[PDB]
Design a protein around this ligand. Structure first.
Ligand SMILES: NC(=O)c1ccc[n+]([C@@H]2O[C@H](COP(=O)([O-])OP(=O)(O)OC[C@H]3O[C@@H](n4cnc5c(N)ncnc54)[C@H](O)[C@@H]3O)[C@@H](O)[C@H]2O)c1
Ligand SMILES: NC(=O)c1ccc[n+]([C@@H]2O[C@H](COP(=O)([O-])OP(=O)(O)OC[C@H]3O[C@@H](n4cnc5c(N)ncnc54)[C@H](O)[C@@H]3O)[C@@H](O)[C@H]2O)c1
Lengths: 485, 485, 486, 485
């Protein structure tokens, strides 16, 4: 694996001739992304990001394209990789590399290292390409991360440099841990302070997802978070909309492309009843399913029951579930003993961030046979029972891998939050300690207001007398810091 | 255009080498179509359809492939074509020509003339193939229709022969009407009684949708119904299930693939509140759209309202609609006036059985400029306003054009009913006069019973005093003839 | 001895006539919510289509019924009225009907009414005979307006025993209402001999409002026993697809909220039956956050319950887990004593069918379980052997009208428009009807539906000349074939 | 007005003979209130509240009665008054004064000063009764508040005492403001530090509603909150269940009792989209209504739109609404002006905490005539238009004025949180300063867990390795502090 170069842009993607079809959907997506457009207009002259060099780990989709060309429209230089092996949309990747005014032959866009259907080896390769800038004296000075793989690579790789050695891996280290480490080990043979120099260059990380943000909270508590981080996941306009309303749209997209299995009349098991779970269950309900949920949190559980859902354990429900979805951000939800209890031709998929919510490592060692139906749809048969399980996306996130992820309108919230967070960490950089921060409420409202307008919502303006009575400014913020919406 | 023959089988399709992919999904499909699988088992011995030569005009999909292969398992010969130029699933076309035990080099299935993306001319050519059996002495003897296109062809065809002329088409007749006429006319040159003979030979037609059944009721009212017809659309297990629940599923699949636009938050306009309209609104609603309905029938109108929908006219509503779907079975729902009024990048599609629900002819002659984004998605632009519209499937049923149609489990009801009507008309032709029939309630109940059973429902059994209180047999039909479900 | 009251020439038996002014206020509000009936008063005001009609009505004595009663009188008809349930009467509504739009309690101008909330079985049948029995033996009732067939049954059985020349004895183990019904007939026979025979001869037609009563008319007609014409009012599309469904969706949870104040959200709800009423039931409970399961004997209804997100289960497997149990079948013997004894502590048990035989009320009353009345129509039963108590609504009689008010005015507007349309048809075109069971014609259902679309603010599209041609329909309707199921 | 006494207990209630009906519904409520019931068992022997003298201002309902008897079962002494003029359940007041073991003759319960249909004069007299403990050396040491009127009475009272003047009222002050001061000024003529000594005696207040809480925030802000407060409202188990799921149940109850107008098919207008408004909107949706929402907060607005609801202004939507419901906790939502614009027989009510969301004061001055239909249902007519409006509960909260408020199972959450806040503020009292606190997550989850098992919900237990993965204890808390559920 070696990068390609064309008119001064280095990259690796499926197919550069997909740019026209890429660019077509870019423009449509832009009508569906008023958050990002409004920010381009608000920030064109200002150039808030001049001097920013952004390293991005984020699903290389159409919506991430519009995100990228917003970031560059505010002065940033970017380099990009997907944060999932299947989530790349090749046509969006190509329009990124070509740019709005370039061609396949003479691309005038940004470096992108991503294509749909990476191996774990090429993924980690593309991840290192995105963090590695041409001139050794101006490395990445900023990170846009989703999952924390960009962040994790930087900080473990500094830890290994500062310790002196990149460690061995045993056996029951995941196949990815090997690959991950393999990358850093070889890197060390030739380069003794690569990551350390990146880590002091980087002003901040902004992190998109619940999981990445969890990893962030564990670096801060170790003492190992080297630069500030905005938790973008926990914008109100991120979680309460993307995680939930995004998934309500995209779960069922993922399952329809995978399987064309009817949803109505079916027993559907959702594991997890957070924002993602709530989105899944709502979607399944709307479609006529008989939805049951799992949960470890008594509160989240009380909500599911108040929404008409049984609250049940995997063990109790698994043998009779027609569709099983894991949505927990946790590992070990569907183990092999579960998969063997499942019914013939039941569907099994994961919509959390990682491929370990489902025992894929166990299923591959089990003596089941895999028959590939088509991209990202696999049919697994146990010979002892005769029963087959349809597995979506090798247990990686079915929505981004079997479909196209959330809709443009949803990501317009998420990526508008992401843009803002980068501006703030870049322009107001000494205003931050080495901690996880969340955006101010005024800015959450800013973003919400763009989409209410875009949708045709008519807001009531508080009178002077009304805002004295509520103790708030007419123009926001409207709620206490602990308001949960 | 001429047939391909390979191993004694004529056919014309996209690509024969897709038979294994088709086969895999067909086999998956059999696990989701207990209705068809169960009639295969019941009637394997009997071979109820021996001597049948069935010409089938029905969307060449995986679910049809399973119907087709149900009929051949019961001893019928078939010749097949799609009832729509975009509806064919080519991997399934391949699967049926190859057969369950053939390969592409040695195919062992049946004649299929169908591919996704036919032209009108090719559509009519394909259809003639399907109705024209190899042996002049052994013409088609059954028609299995969906939309009445095969029925119309035999009957206008015969009509023109008894007339000794095929009418010249008027200079402003629709493109398809000219094609249709030109096909018949070209044939009257070399074969003067082809269609009359076929019509003498055909013992029955089974009709699967509302539009087509209308046309039967029109041939009958004219005295021009030359054979018995079973109205399969209006089996309870068909209309109340396929038309409603099918659409609830396949509509948003159609939209997610064609456009990937967020439904939640959007103003959705659904023209028509028949079963298909009911299904669309249910679908949109569950997904968070703000749904308004149009209707001409105050009964269906009041139902919408009672379901939480504004009942509005296209004129008052079109300006505001983010997504516009026609679901009427009628022509001229959305004229060029209406399209020129839609907001920028609004979406327009038709899920009714033909493409005159939208004014595609007016849109094609308008002067607007077309840009194909990808198959079955076109962005139309008007110079005088600068507004562009996303048109799905060129006004053709969008669930099948832009997606896969209804799921297997749904189609199992419809096709079990079609299978049953085929058997009835074939084995008992004498019991039927030249009229349009519906199947007895007890058969509808049979099909229902199989699917409840498949999903895990537990039916209650009437005691003897109960059954006598209700005036019904414990097993027997359970509801009066006028019962509306 | 129960005897009627007479004030100002108007005989009646009701709770309290001082309730008229209240009743009247609510009736007036109710007219705003019943455009169906209101438009019918307007359209038929000078044609007086019901002059000479003497209508005996057996239908819940509610605010909505009162508006129907006065629609019929606005149109020339005379009436005598009883409720078709011992708990369904709204006493202030009863009051206002006897008083009239312009009467007072001391100077009543209304019509005869025999109904109060909390009747006994014997009072119910007495009230029923009072309603059926017009003042002049030479001017008997000539029309029946029925809900559940009790009037029609009283007459048709009443005549069939006369002829038989005697009224049977009842068995040790006959239902208590049967012994009562029989004792009424047998007692009148000792004095009168052709009372019901002459009445059944006088009646020009019956209009039946509900599913249960229509089964009974099908069962009279099949036996050669239907002796005047019938219109099945239930199977108007505007009736069944609207009242039975959307109506029950309103009034089911009303009944439960009044009866119990139990949170519906998070609870397991067993709905027996998935006809239009079961569908209304499950809809209503689903939207309140309930965990809904359904029982059914019919695979079509059952396949719909499943496609709507509901398990289809037997009472046997379901009963131990359900927090609220609602019967909605039209059938007998749905929740037996073994079933009730299996219910969890303080689960709620309700019937929303037309008769109380859906729940084993006789069985439970002879079980040995102790009864404590909580309040009007909420009773708490205790089994000594398990220590479990169950909350029984309306002593097993329809719970929406027993524990609440029934369906809203807007919903009844549709049903009552249809019945009013039927009465007029059967009265003025009596000639063309045979002694069969009839349904209204589509254009009339459409008429009803249109008033209500109009009232609600909805805009109907009008077919062009080409669309109507293309569909083979007149522009002005009817819009659908005869078998169309909506 | 002077209180009654009987067997040592002073009270002013409607009718003591209602105690039997009172007590039967109490025992049924207890089966619907596992939170309260688990706290009676947990804390029976520990007697945590001994020495607590709790002044209760909260809706005198069946549910509040099971709360009270939990408090007394835990050692507290209490005096009670309702916090709304119509919300008292006369028979719950009775069973409370009688106790489980007394008779109407010899009551063995607690002091209550509450009945349905108090005048403003009577409401305030009763609040003072409730706060004025019989021994001067043992005044109130605890307040349990809903709406902040008890808190207001105590801290304004004291403030006027420290200033030597209860300030003369202005000729057209809100009628309620005049009654407030008349009560103070009159006590002040004879008692110059009644409230000062009461404020110095109260160790803390536990506040139950969003609106009470607001006021608490405006005491702290001014430096005037002279004891610790607990925000009970903002336990997850309170706001996300009571405000939301409570209202979903009770809104429609109050409407059905008051009016028995069909909800399906009607245009409903919900002002405000917080927890209450989401509750209302949810409820009206399920019943079939064509619901529109008003809002000032774009985040809340974007939720309503994602949820199938137009966001609109009163002005735009008022002439067309069938049912208008304000859920804002703000003032001046519906003015006389909007009221005059309402359609004939439109229904109008308020479900926020005070009456002034609707311009009641201006309605009464308008020249509209009031006809009382029955308790809490009034018909108002404008002679100049001839149109009438049904106003519910004189614009006081309609669920508790026209019905019975939230059901037992919902209030089991609120009142378990309340009982816990009372234990904590009382037993661990020194650990608290004169600020507004919120209970710790682990306590919320504790309350949630009781109700989930009561409902038959089966929680999943995290493995050691699962807990370690998430960095949480197997027994919780499971979420960070900013988690919004
Ligand atoms: N695409 C699919 O997967 C699928 C499935 C089933 C049926 N269909 C096709 O769907 C169409 C509708 O079928 P259906 O079973 O719902 O029919 P339907 O007869 O049940 O309802 C169509 C409704 O549209 C209303 N309508 C007619 N003209 C109108 C106008 N100008 N404006 C607004 N409303 C109008 C009618 O009153 C009618 O109720 C038919 O062509 C049918 O063949 C498609
Ligand atoms: N309370 C009301 O306001 C109200 C309103 C309308 C009708 N009703 C009454 O409700 C009843 C139902 O009316 P409907 O129109 O829904 O009837 P329906 O005939 O449309 O449905 C009743 C259902 O009960 C099912 N059933 C029969 N026996 C069964 C059993 N043992 N277990 C489970 N299901 C069984 C049948 O399959 C049927 O579909 C009738 O008695 C009618 O008079 C009451």
């Amino acid at each position: 694996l070696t990068p390609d170069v064309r008119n001064g842009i280095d990259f690796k993607i499926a197919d550069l001739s997909l740019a026209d079809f890429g660019r077509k959907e870019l423009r449509i997506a832009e009508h569906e992304m008023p958050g990002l457009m409004s920010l381009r207009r608000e920030y064109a002259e200002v150039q808030p990001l001049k001097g920013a060099r952004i390293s991005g780990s984020l699903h290389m989709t159409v919506q991430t394209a519009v995100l990228i060309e917003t970031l560059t429209a505010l002065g940033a230089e970017v380099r990009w990789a997907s944060c999932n092996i299947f989530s790349t949309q090749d046509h969006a990747a190509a329009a990124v590399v070509v740019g709005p005014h370039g061609t396949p032959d003479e691309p005038k866009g940004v470096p992108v290292f991503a294509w749909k259907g990476e191996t774990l080896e090429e993924y980690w390769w593309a991840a290192e390409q995105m963090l590695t800038w041409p001139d050794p004296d101006k490395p990445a000075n900023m990170i846009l991360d989703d999952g924390g793989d960009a962040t994790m690579l930087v900080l473990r790789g500094m830890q290994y440099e500062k310790a002196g050695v990149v460690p061995p891996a045993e056996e029951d280290d995941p196949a990815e841990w090997k690959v991950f480490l393999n990358l850093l080990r070889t890197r060390f043979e030739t380069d003794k302070d690569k990551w350390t120099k990146i880590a002091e260059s980087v002003k901040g990380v902004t992190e998109e997802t619940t999981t990445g943000v969890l990893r962030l909270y564990q670096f801060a508590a170790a003492g190992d978070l080297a630069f500030p981080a905005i938790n973008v996941n926990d914008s109100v306009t991120k979680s309460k909309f993307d995680n939930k309303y995004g998934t309500r749209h995209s779960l069922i997209d993922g399952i329809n492309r995978g399987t064309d299995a009817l949803i109505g009349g079916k027993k559907v098991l959702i594991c997890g009843y957070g924002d993602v779970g709530k989105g899944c269950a709502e979607a399944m309900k709307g479609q006529g399913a008989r939805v049951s949920v799992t949960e470890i949190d008594p509160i989240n559980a009380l909500q599911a029951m108040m929404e008409g859902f049984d609250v049940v354990t995997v063990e109790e429900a698994i043998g009779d579930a027609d569709i099983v979805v894991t949505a927990t951000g946790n590992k070990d939800i569907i183990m092999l003993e579960h998969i063997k209890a499942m019914k013939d031709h039941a569907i099994l998929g994961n919509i959390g961030h990682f491929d370990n919510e489902i025992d894929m490592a166990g299923l591959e060692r089990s003596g089941a046979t895999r028959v590939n139906v088509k991209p990202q749809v696999d049919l697994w048969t146990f010979g002892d029972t005769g029963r087959s399980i349809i597995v979506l996306s090798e247990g990686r996130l079915l929505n981004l891998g079997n479909a196209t992820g959330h809709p443009s309108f949803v990501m317009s919230n998420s990526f508008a939050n992401q843009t803002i967070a980068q501006i703030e960490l870049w322009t107001k950089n000494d205003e931050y300690d080495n901690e996880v921060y969340r955006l101010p409420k005024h800015l959450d409202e800013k973003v919400a207001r763009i989409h209410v307008e875009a949708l045709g919502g008519h807001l009531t303006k508080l009178t002077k007398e009304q805002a004295e009575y509520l103790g708030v400014d007419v123009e926001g913020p409207y709620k206490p810091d602990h308001y949960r919406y």
